[PDB]
């Protein structure tokens, strides 16, 4: 059938970051002119290959990975990054094949009184591996005193919150990202 | 600092092979995406290709131009880049950059370049 | 092949005053962009990466602005040595293309 890329960009509803969705694009059609010949987007970087080939490519499983950040974070979600999200909310492979796609959220995901329905992971005691999912709302405990899962001085509940006024400069505002991943596995190559 | 030292470069007959050299210091060459860019003289700047870094094993895309004539590779022990131009034109004449990146999408350091000329 | 025309090609301006100089591209390659400025016979130095980040040590009267097709490079307050060929530079697709340059002459 014709691929549901529809679906994940044009969702009216985005996971946060340290939940982020991920959606298996398997045994279908991929047009993918569809995204390089949109104007909507802030971000179309392709690390394995390449944007305008990608119709004339095939793969075995596609993967793609929806969420919503700040705009000055968008540089995070890429081969090599240290920081927050890349850290303890989503991490790309240093041999990352496929292509981050962003762009800026304001209109859907800024509300005039506030929205705070969007939540990065503050405090991790690892970095996630390449493609890890934690949705652990365990206490974090950077105090000598240990909490018996009882947020206080040095207990910090991991997860935070965004703040998306919408006039909140670029850098501050929304931006929904999709990641989509090529693999080719020994397998037949079930998507062109 | 960051040093990248290209070499080879000098007078060739048409149709006859050159192989200049990019020697990169201060960085692990691994890590970097290091492409070719070449400059005939008084005119622009043109891509001749890429390797990338060894995390996407080191592989290889050319310009049209250079493609099927031109090869480039790597030796990781050397710390230096390779470009190996065979059935040469006199449009073949330029300076030769190498560019590296620690990112596949601009050029951080450039090259001093190597001059080759391809005449009669 | 993504071809980028520079506007303008060869430009005239005293020193303090405020140049800008646009790149534009056959398709949308988003904020996929950089510049770089060339001194004669020496190698480019990178001013400018992904429209509007400017590099450690480049000097902050060096700005990028722009996305989709069009994009532009700006001296505010031209200083002196800024006597250079100004190169846009796509990194969206390969092949790795690059803009015709703009060659910036001095008013005096």
């Known amino acids: 059938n014709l691929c549901p890329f529809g679906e994940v960009f044009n969702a009216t509803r985005f996971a946060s970051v340290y939940a982020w969705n991920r959606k298996r694009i398997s045994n279908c059609v991929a047009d993918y002119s569809v995204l390089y010949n949109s104007a909507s987007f802030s971000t179309f970087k392709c690390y394995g290959v390449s944007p305008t080939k990608l119709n004339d490519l095939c793969f075995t499983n596609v993967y793609a990975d929806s969420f919503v950040i700040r705009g000055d974070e968008v540089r995070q979600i890429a081969p090599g990054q240290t920081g927050k999200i890349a850290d303890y909310n989503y991490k790309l492979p240093d041999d990352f094949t496929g292509c981050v796609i962003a762009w800026n959220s304001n209109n859907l995901d800024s509300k005039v009184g506030g929205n705070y329905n969007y939540l990065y992971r503050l405090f991790r005691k690892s970095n996630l591996k390449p493609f890890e999912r934690d949705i652990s709302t365990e206490i974090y405990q950077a105090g000598s005193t240990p909490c018996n899962g009882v947020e206080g001085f040095n207990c910090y509940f991991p997860l935070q919150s965004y703040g998306f006024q919408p006039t909140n400069g670029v850098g501050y505002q929304p931006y929904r990202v999709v990641v989509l991943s090529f693999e080719l596995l020994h397998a037949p190559a079930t998507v062109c | 600092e960051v040093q990248l030292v290209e070499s080879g470069g000098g007078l060739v007959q048409p149709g006859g092979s050159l192989r200049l050299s990019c020697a990169a210091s201060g960085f692990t060459f691994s890590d970097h995406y290091m492409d070719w860019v070449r400059q005939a003289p008084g005119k622009g700047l043109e891509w001749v290709g890429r390797?990338?870094?060894?995390?996407?094993?080191?592989?290889?895309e050319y310009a049209a131009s250079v493609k099927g004539r031109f090869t480039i590779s790597r030796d990781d022990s050397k710390n230096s880049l390779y470009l190996q131009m065979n059935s040469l034109k006199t449009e073949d004449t330029a300076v030769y950059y190498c560019a590296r990146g620690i990112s596949p999408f601009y050029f951080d350091y450039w090259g001093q370049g190597t001059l080759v000329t391809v005449s009669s | 092949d993504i071809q980028m025309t520079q506007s303008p090609s060869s430009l005239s301006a005293s020193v303090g005053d405020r140049v800008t100089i646009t790149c534009r591209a056959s398709?949308?390659?988003?904020?996929?962009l950089n510049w770089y400025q060339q001194k004669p016979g020496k190698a480019p130095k990178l001013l400018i990466y992904?429209?509007?980040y400017l590099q450690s040590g480049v000097p902050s009267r060096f700005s990028g602005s722009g996305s989709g097709t069009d994009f532009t490079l700006t001296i505010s307050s031209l200083q002196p040595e800024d006597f250079a060929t100004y190169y846009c530079?796509?990194?969206?697709?390969?092949?790795?293309?690059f803009g015709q340059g703009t060659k910036v002459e001095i008013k005096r």
């Open positions: 530079q796509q990194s969206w697709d390969t092949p790795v293309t």
């Open positions: 992904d429209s509007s």
């Open positions: 398709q949308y390659i988003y904020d996929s």
């Open positions: 390797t990338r870094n060894k995390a996407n094993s080191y592989t290889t």
